C-alpha cells in the first residue's frame, strides 16, 4: 500500500503523509537524509504551460563590450587566417589580440572609433600579424 500519485505533492510529502495515516510502518532509508539535507526546491509536479499574449521569458542576451570591437574586426578582416583552437583554455586568436590592443589605445584616451581601428591595425602590422582587409 502506497501513494502512486506523482501529480500530488512530492515523494517526501507523500511518504510523510502515509506514515501519519498509519499505512507505512517503517521509514525508508532515504527519508531521514532528505529531512536533514533537502533539495533547494520541492519536487512537485507542474504542467508545463505555453506563454500567450505579451508574456515573455527573462533571459539576458550575453553581449560584452568587446563584441562591438569584434563585430567590426570580422566585418573588415573576417576571421584570422590562423585557425581557432577551442581546446586550449588560454588561446589568443588574432581577433582577441586586436581587441586587447584596441582596449589599450582606448585607455590612453583616444575617443574616436575610427582612430582606434586604424591605429590598432598599424600596431599589429608592426607585430607581424598578417591582417588582410578582405572586402570579399
Amino acid at each position: 500500500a502506497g501513494s502512486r500519485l506523482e501529480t500530488v505533492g512530492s515523494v517526501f510529502s507523500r511518504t510523510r503523509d502515509l506514515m501519519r495515516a498509519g499505512v507505512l510502518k517503517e521509514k525508508p532509508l532515504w527519508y531521514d537524509i532528505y529531512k536533514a539535507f533537502p533539495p533547494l526546491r520541492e519536487p512537485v509536479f507542474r504542467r508545463p504551460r505555453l506563454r500567450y499574449g505579451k508574456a515573455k521569458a527573462d533571459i539576458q542576451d550575453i553581449f560584452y563590450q568587446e563584441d562591438q570591437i569584434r563585430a567590426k574586426f570580422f566585418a573588415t578582416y573576417g576571421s584570422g587566417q590562423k585557425a581557432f583552437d577551442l581546446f586550449n583554455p588560454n588561446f589568443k586568436s588574432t581577433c582577441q589580440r586586436f581587441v586587447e590592443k584596441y582596449t589599450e589605445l582606448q585607455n590612453l584616451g583616444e575617443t574616436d572609433e575610427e582612430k582606434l581601428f586604424v591605429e590598432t591595425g598599424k600596431a599589429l602590422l608592426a607585430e607581424g600579424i598578417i591582417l588582410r582587409r578582405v572586402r570579399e
Partner: protein, 216 residues
C-alpha cells in the same frame, strides 16, 4: 489492510461488441477506500464478471491513497469551491455536531476519510467519476493553518462565539514572526456566490432545504 474499508460508488453493466459472442459483457465498477483517519483513495475496475471488477478496483485504489487534512480531526480546514469538468462542488467548514449534509456519495467518502461535520452542494453534472475525482482534487489541495502561518509569517488566531473574545492561537510560524500587519482592505474584492449570499439576504429557501434527516 484490515483497518481499511471499501465502498462502491457506481456499477455499470455494459455489453460490448467482440467476435467471441458478437456482443461481450463488461462490468465497470468505481470504488473508494479509506481507513477513516485521513487516508483514502478511489479506483476504477473493469472485468467481464462483477466479482473480478470488484477485486481489481479494490486493490488498485489501495495504491492511490490520498491523505486528507482534517481540522481538529472532524472537518475541512476551510471552505472549498471548485469545478471539475462540468461538476461543481462547494464545501463548507462547519462546527462540531453539524453532521454530514452532503451528496450521498460525498457522505460515503467523507466517512472513509474521517470527516464528521461538513456541508457540500453539487451542481451541474452528477457524473460519479467527476464528483469523486473533483472531491479528492479539492480535499487534497487544502491549506492547513500551519501552512498559512508559515507562508505569511503571522500568527493564525481563532475566535469562537462560544468562547467570547478569547483569542485562540491555532498556528504559530515555525521560523521568524513578522512585524508587518497583514493589509486589511476597507472593502474586500472577494467573489461571492449568490447561493451562499441569497440566504443571508432574507430570501426564502426551497421546501426541500434543511429537512429532518437521520443521523449521518
Amino acid at each position: 489492510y484490515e483497518d481499511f474499508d471499501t465502498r462502491i460508488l457506481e456499477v455499470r453493466n455494459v455489453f460490448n461488441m467482440t467476435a467471441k459472442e458478437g456482443r461481450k459483457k463488461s462490468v465497470r465498477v468505481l470504488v473508494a477506500v479509506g481507513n477513516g483517519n485521513g487516508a483514502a483513495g478511489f479506483a476504477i475496475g473493469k472485468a467481464a464478471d462483477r466479482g473480478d471488477a470488484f477485486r481489481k478496483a479494490k486493490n488498485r485504489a489501495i495504491h492511490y491513497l490520498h491523505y486528507i487534512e482534517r481540522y481538529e480531526g472532524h472537518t475541512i480546514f476551510h471552505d472549498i469551491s471548485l469545478r471539475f469538468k462540468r461538476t461543481q462542488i462547494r464545501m463548507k467548514k462547519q462546527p462540531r455536531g453539524y453532521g454530514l449534509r452532503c451528496h450521498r456519495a460525498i457522505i460515503t467518502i467523507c466517512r472513509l476519510i474521517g470527516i464528521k461535520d461538513m456541508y457540500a452542494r453539487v451542481t451541474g453534472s452528477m457524473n460519479m467519476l467527476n464528483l469523486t475525482r473533483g472531491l479528492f482534487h479539492g480535499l487534497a489541495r487544502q491549506e492547513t493553518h500551519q501552512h498559512l502561518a508559515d507562508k505569511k509569517g503571522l500568527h493564525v488566531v481563532e475566535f469562537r462565539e462560544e468562547c467570547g473574545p478569547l483569542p485562540i492561537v491555532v498556528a504559530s510560524p515555525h521560523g521568524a514572526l513578522s512585524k508587518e500587519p497583514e493589509p486589511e482592505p476597507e472593502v474586500p474584492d472577494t467573489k461571492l456566490d449568490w447561493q451562499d449570499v441569497k440566504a443571508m439576504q432574507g430570501l426564502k429557501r426551497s421546501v426541500w432545504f434543511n429537512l429532518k434527516r437521520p443521523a449521518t
